[PDB]
Amino acid sequence: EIPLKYGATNEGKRQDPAMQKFRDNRLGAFIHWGLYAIPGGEWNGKVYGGAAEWLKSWAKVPADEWLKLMDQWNPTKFDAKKWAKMAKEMGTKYVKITTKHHEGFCLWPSKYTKYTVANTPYKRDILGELVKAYNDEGIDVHFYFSVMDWSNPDYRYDIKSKEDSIAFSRFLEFTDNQLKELATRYPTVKDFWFDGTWDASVKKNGWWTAHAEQMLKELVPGVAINSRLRADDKGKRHFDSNGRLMGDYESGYERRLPDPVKDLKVTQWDWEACMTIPENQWGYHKDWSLSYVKTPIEVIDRIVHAVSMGGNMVVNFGPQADGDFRPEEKAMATAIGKWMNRYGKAVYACDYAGFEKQDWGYYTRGKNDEVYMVVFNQPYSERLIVKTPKGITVEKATLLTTGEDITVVETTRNEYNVSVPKKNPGEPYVIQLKVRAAK
Numbered sequence: 144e145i146p147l148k149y150g151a152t153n154e155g156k157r158q159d160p161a162m163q164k165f166r167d168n169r170l171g172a173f174i175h176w177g178l179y180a181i182p183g184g185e186w187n188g189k190v191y192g193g194a195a196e197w198l199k200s201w202a203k204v205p206a207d208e209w210l211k212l213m214d215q216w217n218p219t220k221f222d223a224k225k226w227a228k229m230a231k232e233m234g235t236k237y238v239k240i241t242t243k244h245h246e247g248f249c250l251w252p253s254k255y256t257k258y259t260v261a262n263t264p265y266k267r268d269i270l271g272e273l274v275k276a277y278n279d280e281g282i283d284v285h286f287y288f289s290v291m292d293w294s295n296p297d298y299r300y301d302i303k304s305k306e307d308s309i310a311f312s313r314f315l316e317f318t319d320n321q322l323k324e325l326a327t328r329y330p331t332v333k334d335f336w337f338d339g340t341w342d343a344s345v346k347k348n349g350w351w352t353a354h355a356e357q358m359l360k361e362l363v364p365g366v367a368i369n370s371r372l373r374a375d376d377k378g379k380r381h382f383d384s385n386g387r388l389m390g391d392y393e394s395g396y397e398r399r400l401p402d403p404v405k406d407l408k409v410t411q412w413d414w415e416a417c418m419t420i421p422e423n424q425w426g427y428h429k430d431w432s433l434s435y436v437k438t439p440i441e442v443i444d445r446i447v448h449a450v451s452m453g454g455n456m457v458v459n460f461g462p463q464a465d466g467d468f469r470p471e472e473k474a475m476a477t478a479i480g481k482w483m484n485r486y487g488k489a490v491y492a493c494d495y496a497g498f499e500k501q502d503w504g505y506y507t508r509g510k511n512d513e514v515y516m517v518v519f520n521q522p523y524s525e526r527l528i529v530k531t532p533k534g535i536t537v538e539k540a541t542l543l544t545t546g547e548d549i550t551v552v553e554t555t556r557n558e559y560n561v562s563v564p565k566k567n568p569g570e571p572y573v574i575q576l577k578v579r580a581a582k
């Protein structure tokens with residue numbers, strides 16, 4: 144046991160209703176919108192293959208020149224009600240929005256910097272319009288916030304002098320003032336998801352990360368705070384020096400989800416994965432031919448994968464500079480929503496089932512002991528193997544969409560073959576099991 148002042152304070156999952164709602168939501172969308180949407184990955188004739196929201200860095204653009212993109216910020220097609228309607232039809236229960244990315248441009252009219260939506264041709268409080276519209280559709284709103292800020296000359300990557308230390312203190316005050324402003328201007332916010340906290344400067348200031356968590360929890364009752372914010376006394380991030388999770392949930396698994404056989408430890412804590420549609424573009428990039436672009440079934444597979452291991456999934460969108468979405472993202476949201484309208488009972492408010500993983504797909508467990516078989520890989524055998532834990536039996540199988548009874552055959556003393564449906568559903572599909580626990 145290493146003694147810590149700024150380590151974990153939660154042991155185990157929060158079970159207050161706000162945390163139950165964050166968890167039960169399960170499926171979210173992410174919005175990455177900022178000045179990077181204007182150049183869209185291209186600067187002075189060169190299209191850079193790196194993440195569009197990092198173009199300032201790829202193209203070595205000075206801060207003042209980058210921020211002059213504000214003069215072009217005029218998203219005339221923006222309509223927050225239409226964004227909320229898109230999110231509703233996708234089946235999302237919450238939306239996570241970039242309030243300020245590394246570039247430092249604020250989507251709300253901050254009084255602590257000039258680099259905001261207020262000082263653009265458009266003028267309007269984009270964030271505030273989104274909060275109202277998503278909340279009107281019954282959708283929770285979460286705030287992404289980058290601590291690292293390329294627009295503020297008090298930022299430091301490391302602290303190598305007294306002068307650095309003084310500047311960085313003033314930077315942390317600024318950061319607090321913005322955070323307090325977000326929490327008070329938009330009191331319906333349900334989560335802060337911090338990014339840009341990896342630098343040595345932040346790791347040396349673990350105390351500040353703990354302070355930020357506490358300060359926001361005091362201002363917003365029941366707010367969730369991600370693990371990525373947090374560093375302990377020794378500069379250990381996400382999990383402290385004693386291996387305990389900091390914040391309210393683990394944020395991670397951006398590229399790759401936990402392995403369903405080897406990473407069952409994640410079932411012990413809340414966690415949320417966030418995913419891009421292309422391989423690694425969060426902001427709007429004009430050229431999606433540069434990397435692999437996931438199909439709707441590949442996204443759906445990741446959504447159900449997360450839920451099956453006790454986690455949430457958030458699907459990222461990078462809106463165009465004009466305030467509309469690209470055709471690939473409209474098609475994705477529509478396809479997800481059509482599947483979720485059919486099969487969403489196996490997703491919303493579901494969790495890890497405690498069954499051995501099988502090849503056909505994933506199990507999820509509902510709030511009243513329903514066990515759902517979500518089938519992505521259809522066996523040529525026409526038999527879906529189900530190995531039950533000790534003491535558990537399968538009493539019935541039903542096709543979710545139609546209520547058709549599905550034959551269940553015992554093959555050995557804890558294993559069944561569940562038949563595939565009489566007609567191939569032609570898409571990933573759900574069979575609902577009724578199970579019984581002995582003694």
Ligand SMILES: C[C@@H]1N[C@@H](C(=O)NCc2ccccc2)[C@H](O)[C@@H]1O
Pocket residue numbers: 194196197338341417425
């Ligand atoms: C959710 C994603 N997090 C952001 C990011 O900048 N990651 C890059 C990064 C992560 C760790 C060290 C250096 C760079 C991406 O730009 C998205 O906002």
